[PDB]
Amino acid sequence: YGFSVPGLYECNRYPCIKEVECYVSRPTEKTVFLVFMFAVSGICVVLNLAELNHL
Amino acid sequence: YGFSVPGLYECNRYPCIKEVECYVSRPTEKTVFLVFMFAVSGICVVLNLAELNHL
């Protein structure tokens, strides 16, 4: 997923003719959620590594 | 105009997004009309040239 959800999408899949533009719902909230989940997972990874090193 | 009226047209003029496909009305009849008018004009040109050469 990367780090952001863009508001526009370029689509060229059948049955769409040539290339079309599509518009996403709540891109900013989804980007915020993505970044927050990444940060929480990183904190969890750091804590797990610290415990494992302590072992 | 050339010699034919195609049934499909590819259009990329503002405000159309990127490239779009458009569909023409009765292309075959218009092609027949084009060819017929070209033939009649050619006959007129030939007759005019013949008269001018006769002069």
CA–CA dist B23, A36 (Å, integer):
49
**Residue A42 near residue A34 (C-beta atoms within 8 A):** no
| Quoted resolution (Å) | 2.1
Residue pairs spanning A and B at CB distance below 8 A: 12
Inter-chain touch B19–A21, beta carbons under 8 Å: no
Mutate to test the interface with A, among B11, B19, B22 (most CBs of A within 10 A): B19
Q: Distance between alpha carbon A12 and the CA centroid of its chain, in Å?
A: 22
Q: How many residues does chain B have?
A: 55
CB atoms B19 and A18 under 8 Å: yes
- For residue B20, the chain A residues in CB contact (below 8 A) are 17-18
Q: How many helices (H) and strands (E) does chain A have?
A: 1, 2
